Amino acid sequence: NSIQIGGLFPRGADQEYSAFRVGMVQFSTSEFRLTPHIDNLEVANSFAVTNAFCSQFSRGVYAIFGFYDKKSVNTITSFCGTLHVSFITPSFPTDGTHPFVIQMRPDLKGALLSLIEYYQWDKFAYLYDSDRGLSTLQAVLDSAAEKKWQVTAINVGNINNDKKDETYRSLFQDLELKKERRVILDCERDKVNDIVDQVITIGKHVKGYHYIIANLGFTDGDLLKIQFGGAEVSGFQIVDYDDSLVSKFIERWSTLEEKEYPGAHTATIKYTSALTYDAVQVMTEAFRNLRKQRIEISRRGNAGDCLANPAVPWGQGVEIERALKQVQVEGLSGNIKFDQNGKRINYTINIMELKTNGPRKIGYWSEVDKMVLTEDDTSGLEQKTVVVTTILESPYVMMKKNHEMLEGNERYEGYCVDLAAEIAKHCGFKYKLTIVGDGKYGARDADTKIWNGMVGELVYGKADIAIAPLTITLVREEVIDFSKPFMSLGISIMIKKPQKSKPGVFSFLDPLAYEIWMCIVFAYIGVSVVLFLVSRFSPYSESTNEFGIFNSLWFSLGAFMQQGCDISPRSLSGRIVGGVWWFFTLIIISSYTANLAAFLTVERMVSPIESAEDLSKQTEIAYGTLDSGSTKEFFRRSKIAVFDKMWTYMRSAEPSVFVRTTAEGVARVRKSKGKYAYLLESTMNEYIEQRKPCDTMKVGGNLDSKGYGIATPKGSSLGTPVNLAVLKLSEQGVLDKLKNKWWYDKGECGAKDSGSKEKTSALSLSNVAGVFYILVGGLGLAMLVALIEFCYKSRE
Amino acid sequence: NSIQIGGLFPRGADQEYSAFRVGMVQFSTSEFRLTPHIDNLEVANSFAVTNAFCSQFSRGVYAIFGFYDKKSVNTITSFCGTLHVSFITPSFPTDGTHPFVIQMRPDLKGALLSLIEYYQWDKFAYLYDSDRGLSTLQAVLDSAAEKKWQVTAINVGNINNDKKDETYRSLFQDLELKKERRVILDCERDKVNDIVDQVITIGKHVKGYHYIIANLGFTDGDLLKIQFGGAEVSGFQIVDYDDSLVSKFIERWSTLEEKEYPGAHTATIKYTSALTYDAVQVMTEAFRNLRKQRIEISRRGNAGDCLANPAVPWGQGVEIERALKQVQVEGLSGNIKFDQNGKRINYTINIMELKTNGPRKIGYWSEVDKMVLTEDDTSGLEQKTVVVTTILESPYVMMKKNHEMLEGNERYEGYCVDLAAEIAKHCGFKYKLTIVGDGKYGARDADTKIWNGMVGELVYGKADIAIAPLTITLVREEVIDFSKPFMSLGISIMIKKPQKSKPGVFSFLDPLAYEIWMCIVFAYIGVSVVLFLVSRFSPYSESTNEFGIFNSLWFSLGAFMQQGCDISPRSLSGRIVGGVWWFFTLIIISSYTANLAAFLTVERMVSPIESAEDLSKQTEIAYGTLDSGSTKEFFRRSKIAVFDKMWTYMRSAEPSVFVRTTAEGVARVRKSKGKYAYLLESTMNEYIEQRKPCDTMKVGGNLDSKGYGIATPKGSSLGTPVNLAVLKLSEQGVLDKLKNKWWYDKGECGAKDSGSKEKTSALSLSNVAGVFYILVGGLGLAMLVALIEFCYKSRE
Ligand SMILES: CC1=NN=C(c2ccc(N)cc2)c2cc3c(cc2C1)OCO3
Ligand SMILES: CC1=NN=C(c2ccc(N)cc2)c2cc3c(cc2C1)OCO3
Ligand SMILES: CC1=NN=C(c2ccc(N)cc2)c2cc3c(cc2C1)OCO3
Ligand SMILES: CC1=NN=C(c2ccc(N)cc2)c2cc3c(cc2C1)OCO3
């Protein structure tokens, strides 16, 4: 016996009925075929829906296919659950777990929330039409409360379409007042078409806008209107046309007679009619399985008009409902399986984007995994992070303290790190920072043609790029491509900061200079001799004055040292000598004390090297450079006279003046107590000078001029994008901001600012220790002279 | 009598033919009738045009109305010139002078260039169609060469009906390679519609784009679809529907049956049909005038064919041509006149813009006056200006060096003035800098209620806004209102910078302080007395030493002066006295010379006063404020103890310490040479302190916290917008930039650090002049003592 089924189609659903008849033709079999009796109803009218439902129920219908609306979901559910009559529908799923309702439409709320999370949306509008229920609006509000979103929900279904359908222009100005560029269209195809028309009219389909079409019919709309505006349009598709079943259906679908099959003869199919076809498949499979299980469900050709008291449900409905539940098939809408409540499970919803060349899939969504990308256009060349070989040193690449759990790009900070970050941001590639295995910047080995590991790994591609403190030079640039310099500097000489001068034993002579002391002694002898000669050549008895040669010497000594003698000249010429010597000693003593006072104030005495010219002349202070660095190669090939002199020294030095690392050079400078100097680039020298301790400074006038560049292996396609990005950074001045941050904002060396002033201390015994030694020596000498006299008269 | 005329109507010119028939009905008359013979043909085919022309000539057509194209203009012009047959056309005007061609379409090149130069365009794209001639393109290129425009001319018409594709997108992305937001559409209605459709499709109709529809049919096309995009759309209109005659025509045209007259039953008509109607008017007026002149217009029998050898013309053609030329009427397209070449003159082109509410006229263009604005709906809205009141103050409102010829606001400067006048620009007029009439910030007269110049002018409405160094205070808030203060300030005290202290007569005593000198004298007497006591009470027999009281005094004086004595104590107690006095004198002399050295090296300034209390405590210093400025009100209002003391002084002070102007106060400070002090706002104190000469300084902290604001009469509508503008400027931080530019960046008197001392220079006689006076006085005293002794023994 033929299975009598019922059809409840909405008015104007021509395509749905055409797909229904197509499914009836396709799934008809030799043993039997379903015989539907259909009525066309205004599904929004519950009274008409009930009339049709009871007309079919009294007709002997075993299962009712059809549609419902927000105004008729409840009556359909209640009648089906009370009379135990199964309802297979492609309309929107019921909010609750309603029995005897087979729901062919998958749940969209989870897919919509996952897609919103994928784009990392927090602020967005949610334009909804209430014709399919507010379940998705409730879901987005609940998930906004949970996830801290800001959702502006606007109801567009209240527009009085009976008269006009134009209030959207005033609607979108509210979004303009809220600066909402991200909008969700929870509407069916007609309403989303109207929204898109008004969006285009007011010019909001342009770059910067993003629309999500919150329905399973992304391609069923007129997407071509908004395709070229530049705004992102994305949505969900249940009918993935790139499949065997859908393609086989559509090749016949496009060739059906349009008058016989209204809505057919098109390259695309509305998802509602696709679900209608899949529902026909499901229910015919269910009935064939029921017969295959030898289950009989026949009943008499009359019913209780839905209004018998009490209700009289047949018993075999549970069997039919279970058969419908356990049906699992493959169809146009993907895998089809229902849980015990009729909700579809194991389904897949495709996520698509509307690009300039058309709408195409970007991934899919499933009940077991959320928002899985399609993995199309697979990687293999540019998804791998590039290997950046750099070197470790304080101003550019540092080891961060909490290295026990930090990762490759988080373990390191500095100028190189953030410059690489900015260059990658402009070029659009991902990266990892690695240290150079050789631990040195590398240079060619002379006469042996041996290269360090950097050249081999660059050739092999293991060293993808070298964003590192590497200097521009001709020898390297013919072997590896170099970008435009981001910093200009040169080689500088770095010496230990001199300490305060330590007084010597004979430092009491310091204020007045050696030649002045020589001439003071000579003037003393001359004054004494002239005084004696004046006083004693016949002045007309002899010895009328005490001024013999020895007494003249004693008087001259007393006058210099400002100790009044026991005798004074009484002649004119002798008094002339005395007065001029007195003037001399007054000026000299005043000069000594005034000079000493000047020196005891005002610090900062002497400096070892001034312009690296004296460095090349003097031989006590040994000086060297980094080994295998650019500076050493600079000194080899420099034909400048002073630079050639410096190279001829540095090559022939008996001890090793070179060091492997910059830290080793700084440690050698600090350890070698001022008699070593290290030639290193200006920037690192400034950084070390500003760091603590401040025991080293920069001297010399920036010997040469060189620039830092990002190294690239020869012929690499990455050479020009990094070159243009570095030029962009140089012209925009962000490099200057990084320079300020990493050098000028960390001037921790307060001694350079010279903001503090010391207090003069008491003179130490060391400052005048020499006069004590001269005093004791003279006392001993006097005793010795006295004893001699007594003995004589007693007988990069 | 009837006159036969010809018709050259393109196939598809249905509205043109309908307007022709309507004009023939309307301008019909009983005295004579026009008999049209009409051929419909492809005007782009010269063969068809010429064969129709010859067919119409063969039947003695008096004058030929019709249209032509770029491919057929020359045929018409040549045949009309050779056969002396007049041609009346609404088509594009001929590129040069041509007889027997009456042209109804006004020239657009001048209007287009005027509209371009009104928007101050200098870089725009020019999209042109070839079907209407390249004369406009040539004029644009010539004017661009003359005026240095950048014109990107693109031949949109090159993609003809055979090359029919949606390739405009490639064109518009080509324009995006140059950032060309300004586009001119030199195309007819159809091509303009296609361009606008593609513009809307790819989102080029958004705000920031501006289009000039370069044709006389701005409003006859479909402008509605681009109306709401936000992009500016402007054009030209020859038919003004607000005119009486045009309205009378359209109120009958719109009601006429469209089935009988194609293109009728519309609220608007294409301008070409309007020119067809006016051409019928002109032709019938010309023939009426010919009849009124009784010209023998009867034709000489058979006209013959075109290809006559020689092509002898008929003589009536020149009379007919002149009659057509000298017709002057008013019709749908405004006033109608023709020059000797047939080009229309005295015409008016309406300039229109596409607003959100529809296209509207913004002006009109004529041969005599070019691009005159209509001022309708713009000349709306006491004073038509904003008379900003300022006060001449150096940091805020200076007088320009070129005051003898500068005019307007350029005579002064102001940033906040023009930011506040942005609101006036929104109102629709510029700002005018004006100096306050009484030159004072203004204050209420106490107990008399007499109103100051500001008191009246900012409440009578004579000044609708005031920008000045006018300070916020409570007394003014009850009568006027202020915006948020835009800078901070405080009342501060300004005094003359002290000069270097010149030495006094007795400045040689300065290093050691008065108490030390007193105690030195007392210690001298004590030491001398004790020495005499220990050396002269009975040693056992007295007179064994020379140390009497006078000799003891002499020895102690010599020991202090470090001048050798003649006697020495020669006893234990006496030598104890001597040694302790020697130690005293060593320390004292060293201290004197060391402190003198310290003073002569470092110069300190120490201002006479340091705080507000110093002014209150010091009575000699005369200090005052500006009269009528907010500072004087602050001193009355203040109940603070120190400020109440200051006011109780200044109120009952010596001859008036107040001044009228800031310049007067500064001149008083500089003139008083130290003993005057001026209390005024700090900002002017830093300004004047940084200016030359720097003989003034700011001393002490700010007496209070105050601020300037924008003044406004009570309840005026400008208050809220200027308050919002000030708050926005404060948030934008431009006020800080202005502060830096006007105060910090000037500098010119920057203070030096603790170093950079000037050279010491020699010690002047004044520094030691008093010691000379004491020496000479002592010498005179010694002479006096000696003479006395000789005389005695001689007998805002
Ligand atoms: C480290 C120094 N400190 N002491 C003395 C010095 C000399 C004398 C006395 N009484 C105390 C201290 C000195 C003086 C100078 C000078 C260098 C020195 C060396 O150059 C210019 O005069
Ligand atoms: C460049 C000179 N430097 N030395 C002396 C000078 C004077 C005396 C002695 N014993 C040594 C040196 C000098 C001193 C001055 C002066 C200018 C000079 C000239 O103005 C203020 O005192
Ligand atoms: C303008 C000054 N200039 N001369 C002397 C002064 C004293 C003695 C000699 N020989 C030269 C100059 C002075 C010294 C001072 C002092 C103020 C002055 C006044 O305060 C601390 O010691
Ligand atoms: C605050 C003091 N100020 N005065 C003396 C001092 C010493 C002697 C005389 N006659 C006057 C004043 C002083 C001198 C110093 C010193 C610390 C002081 C302490 O360290 C370097 O020499």
Author numbering:
A (entry chain B), B (entry chain D): 10 to 549, 565 to 819, 1301
From the paper:
Excitatory neurotransmission is principally mediated by α-amino-3-hydroxy-5-methyl-4-isoxazolepropionic acid (AMPA)-subtype ionotropic glutamate receptors (AMPARs). AMPARs couple extracellular binding of Glu to ion flux across the postsynaptic membrane through their ligand-binding domains (LBDs) that are directly coupled to transmembrane (TM) helices that form the cation channel. We used cryo-electron microscopy to capture AMPARs bound to glutamate, while a negative allosteric modulator, GYKI-52466, and positive allosteric modulator, cyclothiazide, compete for control of the AMPARs. GYKI-52466 binds in the ion channel collar and inhibits AMPARs by decoupling the ligand-binding domains from the ion channel.
In the first scheme (inhibited state 1, GluA2-γ2IS-1), we mixed the CTZ-bound receptors with Glu and GYKI-52466 immediately before freezing. Each approach resulted in similar inhibited states, with each domain in the structures only varying by a root-mean-square deviation (r.m.s.d.) of 0.3–0.4 Å. We focus our analysis on GluA2-γ2IS-1 because of the higher data quality. To resolve GYKI-52466 binding, we used symmetry expansion on the AMPAR TMD from GluA2-γ2IS-1 to reconstruct the binding site to 2.2 Å resolution. GYKI-52466 is partially stabilized in the collar through a π-bond stack where GYKI-52466 is sandwiched between Phe623 at the top of the M3 helix and Pro520 on the pre-M1 helix. Van der Waals forces from five nearby residues, Ser516, Asn619, Ser615, Tyr616 and Asn791, also contribute to the binding site. In GluA2-γ2IS-1, we measured the distances between the Cα atoms of Ser741 (D1 separation) and Ser635 (D2 separation). The D1 interface is markedly separated (27 Å) compared to the D2 interface (16 Å). In contrast to the LBD layer, the GluA2-γ2IS-1 TMD is markedly like the desensitized AMPAR TMD (r.m.s.d. = 0.7 Å). Next, we measured the ion channel radius, which indicates a closed channel; the upper channel gate, defined by Met629 at the M3 helix crossing, completely restricts channel access (<1.0 Å radius) to both water molecules and sodium ions.
